[PDB]
Copies of this chain bind each other. A is one copy, B any other.
Amino acid sequence: MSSPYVPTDNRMMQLAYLDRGFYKHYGIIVGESVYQLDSDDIFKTALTGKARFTRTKLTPDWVIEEGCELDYFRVKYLESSVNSEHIFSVDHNCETIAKDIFGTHTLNQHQAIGLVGTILLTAGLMSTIKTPVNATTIKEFFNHAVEG
């Protein structure tokens, strides 16, 4: 008999997005499922602090994000952005999210979803068209915070 073994490694995964017209909605493909924030509006999410992880089934609409804007400097910024208190939570369908994405780890569950949540929220917020920030463009942005 060979020695007892417990693997620690996470699963294979890809960063991907859905076209939402004004932004790219990012998620992590693990097998036939996609971890993502439950949101139709990335600005409302950021401006209200309601960032709940959900899992949905992989479809052919998810674009594999190849040309990556995530680089060393952005990931190091985001790694150090998140303390013990953050806006990210997980619904009923995401019980295995920490094990799927991190494997066996010394990150606690809350820390794990903070780090994943920060990477997905930032990638979405930076996918948008650049426009001057003035009274006018601020007003339309503010609507995402208050319009139901």
Residues of A in contact with B (beta carbons under 8 Å apart): 8-10, 12-16, 22-24, 28, 41, 43-44, 46-50, 60-61, 64-68, 70-87, 101-103, 105-108, 111-112, 114-116, 118-119, 121-123, 125-139, 141-143, 145-148
Contacts and interface: CB of A to CB of B under 8 A. Distances in A.
Copies held by the complex: 4
A41 B81 contact: yes
Given A61-B8, A134-B65, A78 B84 contact: no
B84 A48 contact: yes
Contacts of A78: 73
B134 A67 contact: yes
B141 A72 contact: no
5 contacts: A16-B135, A75-B141, A82-B148, A108-B148, A126-B138
Given A73-B78, A74-B74, A86-B49, A142 B129 contact: no
B23 A122 contact: no
A10 B139 contact: yes
B71 A126 contact: yes
